[PDB]
């Protein structure tokens, strides 16, 4: 239903995209015979001999042609910006189920593939409407307001889309209990798998992604530490995002907590975010995205009240992506929690 | 300190999607995506312009703040849709549309919406320097936006200077646009014309968001600071908040037609028309009616009736030379002469533009000048020979070769083409019935029907009669033309060896020798006046003057020829297609005593006659034999019979005239300013005002006439060859056109080969048309026969229509039958025939040395192998390298 309509708009942008590619690909040559005629008629100083009237009409209808191609460029600007503005709530709602049900897709990988291919392609095409007048511009046309107004609007459009298109698929979890996420003992494995889910890449170099943990120690208790005694990154050559996709799993990494409040062991907060140095077509833009609130344990009995804590916010926390939890939540009406534990041991046996 | 400044504080200092997202948010729009694509297709109906603010005048004028009337002057017209909406008002009597145009602006367009005759929409004129003129309703709509707001306050000050200096008539009402109406300076500017002339401000409800345009209309009688203060509260009331979405609204429509106007018509003589009116009217009496909305001001409307769909502006493209020529797609000249029209829109618009033109009758002293040099001129050629007749078998065999191919009838045997239509007996019978009529005095079968073909670059874009309106008489009365008068067409009765003035009969290959031995005259330069609107400007006392050949004819021959010039020239009728409501192209019938046609074959006699008259008259003013004190009664017939019988033949020894054209060379330079008398007759010029003296050419190798500048070339032998020429674009775009009868692959192939041969003969010296030419010679089969019709002048010999090897044909016309070439030693290789010079051809529109031409000029056999696939490979071809 939804997928075929939005793919129909991916067909629309392919169609009008290639048609406008054609119209530029002829207007450059109409510019070329114009600069020849002016170039050699200007040569030769050896009235109104109709060469003035012809080159008048050549300038005039070249001018009108430039007006029309910018007008259809506006007609696809409104269309693809409506494509983006409707494209975003699918991303955040499927984010909402996507880590609503982690208690124990590539459609959008393709759509960010074609999305950024069309935006960067229209960008790079729009970068040289300059040189269709940088030979000789010489007219009071729409020539600068188009290239830089529309360059600017699509520049902030793909920078907001790059701003909100780097998410996480896989929450951290135990290697020992692969069914209980959001819980890592001091020394457990950072069982995560994210992705640069926008499938464009400069083929220049093998790029890396940095972690970033706990930007702000809050008012309540800036907790002790942990030092990741395993590494913090991997390296993706451009040949493998073309092969497997831009997968970023920082799994199996382990920590060491340093040494030397009514919230306790399973009530402390450590949110890890991820520094991404992203650049394509020269457009440099840094990306960072946080994670779900994860608790840290030290003992097997903390699994019980940790997991009751896990339901105790995962149904009981609107605007949940924040620091310093547990303080004043409301209690649990079990209207879905009953179905949730029903998923648990009625998933197990009867 | 004001309120509207923070549009330009916030909206300046903030981002792009807030401006774009705000700019469409919460504003009243009107649905327009249809006609932006519907009137793009080309429909001249829809009752609404491709504009925006016609809804603004809809809201305002319907709202009652404005009630225009009488004469209306528009300003900053753009697309002019303001004026189109103004046309619908049932008090408007004339609208002048005046605007700038030029590059970086928006040229007008010509949609036949309702009220079509009453527009006068003129581009070009800049109103920085325009004299103030009276009206009854005044409008202005020039508005540009800036960052710092005083920069556009400056423009508001200029335009209030322009309207404030304009409105000094004390007219009735107005509707003036104001850019920035939140200054005290505008209130001081306004309050004078409020205490005097009133009105005030109304915010247009359907303006865009991010501009504060308000219209000083002549209606808003408020205390102005209450109004400005109120809408200036609605400025910040409509400033920000949430993205309040778009309101839509239905678009304006009225329909089409043409509003009835006053008429300067002349009462005709109904006793030479009326039985044809009884023929069509008594033929179509149920469909017959009288449109009161006739757009007929100088002509004579006499009723109407309905009509079928006929005619088409869909004359397609030759695909062949399209598929042979790469860079002659990118230039707009080759597309500039693509498609003319025969549609009723086109006929009505060429009609309005340059047909319905009343002329003032010149003085009687000039009429005696006409009768003296006229009757002198007839008796001058009457001394040499006498009139004769001509016969039918001459006309069958004459139409066998090429003559006109004009296949449209009016009587009931409506067939395909004339060349079979000659093979009937019955049209001889009814032709002889009209000979019984005209030979007794009645007439039933002299009814013109024109088509209006004009040569437009792109549709509906500003051109009035770039090609002339062409009238059609039915073939049978074209034969009565032929037998009646067409001997002058036949036996050279105005050729150079008989009349001494005009070089018709000769083609277009020897004319440059005729001016080049006009080079040996003393005195003047090449004086090559051209005349704007020839056939439009021939008055009644020119063709009343023309009947003096009746003094020389045989008796019954005088009855038939005098009869037919009474029946088709002294009076005439046309029926005329006109678009109207619902696509019902209701066709009228129309009359005028006074103009000539353009399709009849005896018209060479009248025009080349008529301008040899007028330019003997101009040359005898150029010898100062006449003066401007000789206009009213007379001074001396003996001065002009003396100037003739000593001078006149010797003067017209030295000029060349065919059709309306002229090229003269007097012995003085006084000819350039002999202009008064001529404007009394009313034969105005082109690209020179009404009294400005003309411009000569001391050089002769580029003087223009019949759309050709002529060059002379020298051989490797050293042989003086005068060649014709014209600018490359306007011929290579003639082979691009397809007429509408070349439906096959074979018809377009042979017609394209006809262009190949014609260019191979005359236009060899350029680099381009040779490679084009022998290229498409290799493409079309050697087995085939080129037919068709390239040119349209009378100078088309039809010489290059043979299937013969073209070396022989060049060698014939351009060695053998040349008197003007002496040593007739024959050519061997036209490959070793050299060229015109490089830069001079570059003056004439070449693109040698350019990258495209060089590239596909390095691979051509493939390019013709494309079409040798596209046409069958069971043919016979030839190398051309
Ligand atoms: Zn007749
Ligand atoms: Zn030339």
Curated annotation (Swiss-Prot), chain A:
Subcellular location, record wording: Cytoplasm; Nucleus
Location of the region described as Interaction with SFTSV virus NSs in the Swiss-Prot/TrEMBL record: 166-327
Residue positions where Phosphoserine is found in the record: 133, 137
Region named Interaction with heartland virus NSs: 166-350
Stretches that traverse the bilayer: none
UniProt modified residues of type Phosphothreonine: 144
Domain of life assignment: Eukaryota
Physiological role: Signal transducer and activator of transcription that mediates signaling by type I interferons (IFN-alpha and IFN-beta). Following type I IFN binding to cell surface receptors, Jak kinases (TYK2 and JAK1) are activated, leading to tyrosine phosphorylation of STAT1 and STAT2. The phosphorylated STATs dimerize, associate with IRF9/ISGF3G to form a complex termed ISGF3 transcription factor, that enters the nucleus. ISGF3 binds to the IFN stimulated response element (ISRE) to activate the transcription of interferon stimulated genes, which drive the cell in an antiviral state.
Family per record: Belongs to the transcription factor STAT family.
Disease: Immunodeficiency 44: An autosomal recessive disorder characterized by increased susceptibility to viral infection, resulting in some patients in encephalopathy and infection-associated neurologic decompensation.
Protein name, entry field: Signal transducer and activator of transcription 2
Organism expressing this protein natively: Homo sapiens
Gene of this entry: STAT2
Residues of the full protein shown: 140 to 509 of 851
């Amino acid at each position: 239903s939804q997928q075929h309509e939005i793919e129909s708009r991916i067909l629309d942008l392919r169609a009008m995209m290639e048609k406008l590619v054609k119209s530029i690909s002829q207007l450059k040559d109409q510019q070329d015979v114009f600069c020849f005629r002016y170039k050699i008629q200007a040569k030769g100083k050896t009235h109104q001999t109709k060469e003035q009237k012809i080159l008048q009409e050549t300038l005039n209808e070249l001018d009108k042609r430039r007006k029309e191609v910018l007008d259809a460029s506006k007609a696809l600007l409104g269309r693809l910006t409506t494509l983006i503005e409707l494209l975003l709530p699918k991303l955040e709602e499927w984010k909402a189920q996507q880590q609503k049900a982690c208690i124990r897709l590539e459609q959008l990988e393709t759509w960010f593939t074609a999305g950024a291919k069309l935006l960067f392609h229209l960008r790079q095409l729009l970068k040289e409407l300059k040189g269709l007048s940088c030979l000789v511009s010489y007219q009071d046309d729409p020539l600068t307001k188009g290239v830089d107004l529309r360059n600017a609007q699509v520049t902030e459009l793909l920078q907001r889309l790059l701003h909100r298109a780097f998410v996480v698929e896989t929450q951290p979890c135990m290697p020992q209990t692969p069914h209980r996420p959001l819980i890592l003992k001091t020394g457990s494995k950072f069982t995560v798998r994210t992705r640069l889910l926008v499938r464009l890449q400069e083929g220049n170099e093998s790029l890396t992604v940095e972690v970033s943990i706990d930007r702000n120690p809050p008012q309540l208790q800036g907790f002790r530490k942990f030092n990741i005694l395993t590494s913090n990154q991997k390296t993706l050559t451009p040949e493998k995002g073309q092969s497997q996709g831009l997968i970023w799993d920082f799994g199996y990494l382990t920590l060491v907590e340093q040494r030397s409040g009514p919230l306790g062991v399973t009530e402390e907060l450590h949110i890890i975010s991820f520094t991404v140095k992203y650049t394509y077509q020269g457009l440099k833009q840094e990306l960072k995205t946080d994670t779900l609130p994860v608790v840290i344990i030290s003992n097997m009995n903390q699994l019980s009240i940790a997991w009751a804590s896990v339901l105790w916010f995962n149904l009981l926390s609107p605007n949940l992506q924040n620091q310093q939890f547990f303080s004043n939540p409301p209690k649990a009406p079990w209207s879905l929690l009953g179905p949730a534990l029903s998923w648990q041991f009625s998933s197990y046996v009867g | 300190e004001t309120l509207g400044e923070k549009w330009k504080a916030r909206l300046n200092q903030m981002s792009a999607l807030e401006f774009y997202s705000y700019k469409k948010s919460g504003i009243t729009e009107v649905c327009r995506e249809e006609a932006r694509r519907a009137l793009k297709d080309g429909v001249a109906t829809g009752g609404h312009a491709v504009s925006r603010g016609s809804a603004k005048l809809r809201w305002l004028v319907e709202r009652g703040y404005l009630q225009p009337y009488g004469k209306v002057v528009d300003l900053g017209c753009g697309r002019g849709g303001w004026s189109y909406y103004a046309a619908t008002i049932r008090k408007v009597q004339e609208v002048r549309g005046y605007t700038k145009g030029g590059p970086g602006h928006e040229e007008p367009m010509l949609v036949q919406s309702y009220g079509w005759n009453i527009v006068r929409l003129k581009s070009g004129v800049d109103v920085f320097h325009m004299a103030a003129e009276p009206c009854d309703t005044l409008l202005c709509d020039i508005g540009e936006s800036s960052s710092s707001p005083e920069v556009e306050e400056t423009r508001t000050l200029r335009v209030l200077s322009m309207v404030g200096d304009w409105l000094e008539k004390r007219p009735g009402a107005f509707c003036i646009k104001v850019l920035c109406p939140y200054t005290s300076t505008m209130m001081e500017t306004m309050e004078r014309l409020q205490r005097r002339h009133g009105g005030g401000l109304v915010r247009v409800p359907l303006s865009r968001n991010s501009t504060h345009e308000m219209y000083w209309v002549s209606g808003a009688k408020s205390n102005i600071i209450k109004s400005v203060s109120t809408t200036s509260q609605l400025l910040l009331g409509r400033m920000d908040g949430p993205r309040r979405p778009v309101k839509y609204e239905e678009d304006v429509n009225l329909g089409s037609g043409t509003r009835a106007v006053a008429s300067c018509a002349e009462a005709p003589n109904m006793k030479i028309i009326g039985r044809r009116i009884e023929r069509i009217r008594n033929e179509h009496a149920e469909t017959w009616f009288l449109d009161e909305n006739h757009p007929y001001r100088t002509w004579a409307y006499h009723g109407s009736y309905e009509a079928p769909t006929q005619g088409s502006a869909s004359s397609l493209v030759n695909g062949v030379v399209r598929l042979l020529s790469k860079p002659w797609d990118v230039v707009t000249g080759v597309t500039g002469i693509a498609m003319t029209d025969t549609t009723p829109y086109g006929q009505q618009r060429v009609f309005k533009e340059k047909v319905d033109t009343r002329v003032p009758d010149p003085q009687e002293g000039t009429r005696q000048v006409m009768n003296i040099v006229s009757s002198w001129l007839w008796k001058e050629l009457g001394k040499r020979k006498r009139p004769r007749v001509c016969t039918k078998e001459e006309f069958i065999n004459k139409v066998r070769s090429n003559a006109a191919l004009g296949a449209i009838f009016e009587e009931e045997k409506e067939w395909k083409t004339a060349v079979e239509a000659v093979n009937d007996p019955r049209f001889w019978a009814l032709v002889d019935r009209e000979r019984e009529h005209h030979l007794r005095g009645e007439c039933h079968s002299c009814v013109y029907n024109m088509m209006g073909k004009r040569e437009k670059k792109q549709g509906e874009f500003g051109k009035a009669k770039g090609s002339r309106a062409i009238w059609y008489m039915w073939l049978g009365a074209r034969f009565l033309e032929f037998e009646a008068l067409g001997f002058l067409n036949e036996d050279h009765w105005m050729g150079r060896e008989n009349s001494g003035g005009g070089v018709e009969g000769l083609g277009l290959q020897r004319l440059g020798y005729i001016l080049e031995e006009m080079n040996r005259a003393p005195g003047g330069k090449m004086y090559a006046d051209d005349t704007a609107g020839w056939d439009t400007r021939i008055s009644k006392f020119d063709l009343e003057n023309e009947a003096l050949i009746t003094n020389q004819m045989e008796e019954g021959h005088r009855t038939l020829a005098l009869a037919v010039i009474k029946y088709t020239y002294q009076n005439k009728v046309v029926k005329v297609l006109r678009p109207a409501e619902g696509g019902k192209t209701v066709m009228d019938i129309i009359s005028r005593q006074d103009q000539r046609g353009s399709g009849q074959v005896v018209t060479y006699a009248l025009n080349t006659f008529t301008n040899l008259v007028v330019q003997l008259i101009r040359n005898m003013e150029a010898e100062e034999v006449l003066e401007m004190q000789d206009l009213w009664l007379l001074r001396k017939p003996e001065k002009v019979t003396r100037w003739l019988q000593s001078n006149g033949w010797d003067r017209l020894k030295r000029m060349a005239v065919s059709g309306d054209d002229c090229v003269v060379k007097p012995i003085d330079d006084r000819f350039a300013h002999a202009l008064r008398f001529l404007n009394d007759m009313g034969k105005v010029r082109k690209d020179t005002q009404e009294w400005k003296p003309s411009t000569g050419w001391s050089n002769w190798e580029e003087v223009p006439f019949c759309s050709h500048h002529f060059n002379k070339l020298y051989l490797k032998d050293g042989r003086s060859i005068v060649v014709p020429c014209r600018h490359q674009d306007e011929l290579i775009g003639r082979a691009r056109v397809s007429p509408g009868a070349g439906w096959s692959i074979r018809e377009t192939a042979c017609l394209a080969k006809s262009y190949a041969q014609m260019w191979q003969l005359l236009y060899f010296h350029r680099r381009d048309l040779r490679l084009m030419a022998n290229a498409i010679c290799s493409a079309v089969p050697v087995d085939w026969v080129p037919t068709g019709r390239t040119t349209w002048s009378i100078h088309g010999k039809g010489e290059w229509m043979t299937t013969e090897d073209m070396l022989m044909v060049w060698n014939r016309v351009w060695i053998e039958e040349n008197d003007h070439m002496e040593d007739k030693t024959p050519v061997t290789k036209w490959t070793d025939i050299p060229y015109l010079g490089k830069r001079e051809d570059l003056w004439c529109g070449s693109l040698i040395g350019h990258r495209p031409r060089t590239t596909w000029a390095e691979n051509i056999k493939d390019t013709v192998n494309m079409v040798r696939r596209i046409i069958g490979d069971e043919e016979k071809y030839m190398d051309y390298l």
